[PDB]
């Protein structure tokens with residue numbers, strides 16, 4: 001038993017909710033919250049901008065030190081950093097950005113990072129400002145992640161479409 005509440009069960013291991021990932025993280029304090037990161041860990045907008053704002057910019061300060069030491073992530077890659085006030089850890093995962101021309105086949109590689117963590121609270125990867133077909137993102141998630149993933153989907157209309165169209 002875990003602390004996640006109000007989720008629809010899609011599969012043995014994938015759960016979905018019409019909830020604010022920021023508000024959900026603040027309520028649950030999960031072991032891992034996933035950020036929809038870019039390779040520079042520049043948390044300007046979308047999920048990343050919202051998570052970073054909720055940390056009072058501490059996520060960005062930590063991330064700038066990480067990049068100054070290690071250089072950029074790979075598209076499809078990840079790093080584990082602090083979860084600050086939101087979670088124990090933040091798994092920063094880089095899905096491909098369609099609005100930058102990145103290979104959508106890298107979405108499966110992105111979701112494979114989730115398998116290193118037993119339980120995660122996560123954004124549908126490459127949805128919102130990343131612009132990938134979202135329905136597609138949920139299918140890759142279900143077909144790739146084997147650990148227990150709680151997908152907080154804040155956009156309501158989209159939530160209802162994801163549920164209604166789910167095979």
Ligand SMILES: O=S(=O)(Nc1nncs1)c1ccccc1
Nearest residue numbers: 020021022046047050128154155
């Ligand atoms: O793309 S979002 O930034 N995803 C997020 N989920 N939780 C917090 S932000 C977003 C923000 C506002 C409305 C709809 C979507």
